[PDB]
A paper describes a structure:
An unusual case of monoisotypic tubulin that is naturally occurring is the blood cell-specific tubulin purified from the marginal band MTs of chicken erythrocytes (ChET). This tubulin preparation comprises isotypes α1 and β1, corresponding to the genes TUBA1 and TUBB1 from [name], which are orthologs of TUBA1A and TUBB1 from humans. TUBB1 expression is critical for platelet biogenesis, representing 50 to 90% of cytoplasmic β-tubulin, and defects in its function lead to congenital thrombocytopenia. To achieve this, we took advantage of the ability of Cp-52 binding to induce the formation of stable tubulin rings that are amenable to single-particle cryo-EM to solve the structure of α1/β1-tubulin.
In vitrified ice, ChET-Cp-52 rings have a diameter of ∼22 and ∼32 nm, corresponding to ring species with C8 and C9 symmetry, containing 8 and 9 α1/β1-tubulin heterodimers, respectively. The best 3D class was refined by nonuniform refinement, resulting in cryo-EM density maps with resolution FSC0.143 = 3.2 Å for the C8 ring and 3.5 Å for the C9 ring, respectively. The asymmetric unit of the ChET-Cp-52 C8 ring comprises one copy of α1-tubulin with its bound GTP, one copy of β1-tubulin with its bound GDP, and one molecule of Cp-52 between the tubulin subunits. The ChET-Cp-52 C8 ring structure presented here shows compacted tubulin interfaces, causing it to have a smaller diameter than the HeLaT-Cp-52 C8 ring. Measurements of the ring diameter using the α-tubulin subunit center-of-mass showed that the ChET ring structure had a diameter 5.9 Å shorter than the HeLaT ring structure. Specifically, the intradimer interface is more compacted than the interdimer interface, with differences of 1.8 Å versus 0.6 Å, respectively. The diagram shows that the conformational changes are predominantly localized to the core of the β-tubulin subunit with an RMSD in the range of 3 to 5 Å. Although more residues are observed within 4 Å of the bound Cp-52 for ChET than for HeLaT, the overall arrangement of the binding site looks similar.
Numbering used by the authors:
A (entry chain B): 1 to 430
B (entry chain j): 1 to 438
Write the structure that this text describes.
Amino acid sequence: MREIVHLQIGQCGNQIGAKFWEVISDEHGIDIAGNYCGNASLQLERINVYFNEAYSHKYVPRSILVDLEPGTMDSVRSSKIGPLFRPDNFIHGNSGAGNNWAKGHYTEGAELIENVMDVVRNECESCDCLQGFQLIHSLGGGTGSGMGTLLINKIREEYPDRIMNTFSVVPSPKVSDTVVEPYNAILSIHQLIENTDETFCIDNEALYDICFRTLKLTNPTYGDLNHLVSLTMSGVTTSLRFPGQLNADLRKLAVNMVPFPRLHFFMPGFAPLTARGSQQYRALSVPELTQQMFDARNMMAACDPRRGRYLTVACIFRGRMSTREVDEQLLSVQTKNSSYFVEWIPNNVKVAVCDIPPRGLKMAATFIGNNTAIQELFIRVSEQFSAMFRRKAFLHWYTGEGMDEMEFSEAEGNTNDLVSEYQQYQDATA
Amino acid sequence: MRECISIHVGQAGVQIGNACWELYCLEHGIQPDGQMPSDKTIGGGDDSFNTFFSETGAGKHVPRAVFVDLEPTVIDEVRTGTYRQLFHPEQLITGKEDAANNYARGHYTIGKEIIDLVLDRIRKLADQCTGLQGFLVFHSFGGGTGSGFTSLLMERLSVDYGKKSKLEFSIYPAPQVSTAVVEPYNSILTTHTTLEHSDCAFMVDNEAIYDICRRNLDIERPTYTNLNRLIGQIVSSITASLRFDGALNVDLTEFQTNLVPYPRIHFPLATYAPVISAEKAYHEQLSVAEITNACFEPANQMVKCDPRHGKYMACCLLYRGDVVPKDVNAAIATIKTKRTIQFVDWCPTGFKVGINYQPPTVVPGGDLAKVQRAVCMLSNTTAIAEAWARLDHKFDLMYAKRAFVHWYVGEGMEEGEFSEAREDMAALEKDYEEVGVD
Ligand SMILES: COc1ccc(C[C@@H]2NC(=O)/C=C/C[C@@H]([C@H](C)[C@H]3O[C@@H]3c3ccccc3)OC(=O)[C@H](CC(C)C)OC(=O)C(C)(C)CNC2=O)cc1Cl
Ligand SMILES: Nc1nc2c(ncn2[C@@H]2O[C@H](COP(=O)(O)OP(=O)(O)OP(=O)(O)O)[C@@H](O)[C@H]2O)c(=O)[nH]1
Ligand SMILES: Nc1nc2c(ncn2[C@@H]2O[C@H](COP(=O)(O)OP(=O)(O)O)[C@@H](O)[C@H]2O)c(=O)[nH]1
């Protein structure tokens, strides 16, 4: 029996992970006391990937909540999910990294790696078999980005035969006013290129765009964005949480979706995306779900997939739908729009149907795609990095923590080489 | 005096073999606990189902089966199902980590850590058999275990059991129900590795079974249960010459001589006529001439390819049920008047008809209808070169930009093995064309 170890680093990672574990426990029929209360036996099957079953039917998650400040742990414990998590798995330092990637990767991160690796080894030693690691963090902040990439490197050192999956939240100028978030984002992207096998590029710019245009919110808070990411992260791991045809159990998902070792940045999407308290007025059927699944306005990365080629698609449908109509609609989408898919990867669109929908929606459609359009996201973050780096603003806060100035140029060169490789595999034809 | 050891590698092999052993126990009347009502009156072996069912001292008919997977899911499924006590727990081998739809994981890293246990179980089953002919390896071309561990097992059984002949019942990949994108890679690599180690390989694709289920059993969403039941019917009446009285194909050597002229041209094509839905059971009957014509129908084959564009080499018509041998020759003559079937330019013999009078049994609750006349047409033709050309076309498409290759070189394999397997399949295409050109 395989099992994923979940890690949440930073304020954004902790808040999104708390909402994610709430939606996962609602889907699996688990209350906050760790007792099963669903009416279906499918929810109890393949529960060992995420929930650690203790004695007398106690379902505690295998979440390692990590920060450098105890305020996020106090905010998690202030909610209903505080008693749900393991209290020994909360790790927080004395002071935060303060939007400094070097201060979260070289000093405070380095002094907290031994404690978090002790907790990681404590979770790992009780495994009958380890599947891989799932990390939720943000590339913008200091502790999230810096200690996330440090924990990624340390996990890659200790367990090099295990897969590494990240849910990396790329920062935006439309949601945060901090200026050095391109520095942390580009340095973490340079680490994630070389030290990770699976990355779900969630962009706060795309979430702000969805909450601004689609959801009709004048002032989108962090709650609406975290609700969107919790919906998409619940729908993405519905292949891991449930048995199915396209099981895609982490290593199988990486074998299917990743053709090239650096092009492992996915573009998640969720077709009936609606704000809280308003999802009961959505008409749901198959071809509207398929036509909203591939929409650029609906997709959760600030990219235009019409300007790129889908290298590999993993469309997972959720709810009570006829799989004949789902497969007919997706083959119609693949054939009628054959210019948007690569011709050198035959049958790159994989369809699965899970009969358990997320709560609040009768039918749902979660899309995972290794599209080539994510080079627009990397071009945007690298151009903000170049605008903040060509005149060396705030480099003294990074070089004062022991970071060389060559590391910023190495990160810029690595992200530009990744953009060049994406453009090369876009322009090539079989 | 004749004994066979069925091996089921991978999820497809394990599920297909479980359905096949269910149909074998249904055909032989064996109870699920292992006892027999009729043929346990003797209490001894060598009653022509001792090739597959070994008899213990308690009268239990334990099958000569080895179920291998690197994942314990389907092994626990057959350990929980209705034949949980029929199969010994020592012969049902599970694993911890999967091969994850990778050939190099199941052949070099994950399959290499379990190959000695499977070899030990194979030798433990072979030490009980005094007249062992060989093995029937049930696997799939697409998956990681069913390609890589099958290739490793074929290498080990060739270096250990070199006087034995090994059949294969492989599952050719279909895009309709596919678990992975790299199924052409695993298929070409395991076909290159098990070309020198397989003697007669009956590859059946799920696309033809899908089309047959949708157009005959009227299921627009065929699950794996309907496909498993149909392929279990196909393989059961393939093996019905071997588990029953002696007319033809009574041995694995007879299989290798009646159909297989070359060491590399060893891919026959099976065809089955009476695939009818359970609702349409009493609508009409089926004559011998029309079921022979449907056995020569290109839409009824177990491989989606066209035999009329290629040239035949052999035909072993295997009739089941109460079929009189008189009108079979009239059906043969009406087939022979059709010059679409064009044999090779050597002495071609013809349609080697053998008739088994045991009626065919279908699974109760299955979608297949109970029939009185059944027919299996094992034909060696050059039409399988179309399927291998489709596989090498997808291989060339994915390998032009070296997509997904890092998942294979990272698990111990070399870069040049892909080009070597591509050249071997090009040579197999050339061999099929050279037989096809006269
Ligand atoms: C276009 O290609 C074809 C054209 C026609 C056919 C029809 C097919 N021709 C062949 O099998 C040719 C076989 C070559 C020898 C080979 C050379 C023997 O050393 C092999 C051997 C076998 C067993 C033990 C020791 C040695 O096999 C036989 O003599 C087999 C052995 C039987 C008694 C078991 O006996 C027959 O032949 C049968 C079963 C009585 C009739 N067979 C046929 O009509 C097939 C093909 Cl593929
Ligand atoms: N007919 C039929 N085909 C099956 C069945 N199960 C799996 N397959 C085929 O198996 C192919 C892939 O192999 P897998 O199912 O992944 O099994 P495997 O060889 O063990 O591969 P891994 O599980 O990853 O180790 C697919 O293309 C399916 O067509 C089945 O029950 N019936
Ligand atoms: N989508 C989303 N992003 C967030 C949320 N909270 C913070 N962020 C982003 O994540 C970054 C904060 O990183 P953080 O974990 O606080 O690092 P720290 O400043 O060192 O503690 C900022 O760039 C924010 O843009 C949230 O609730 N939702």
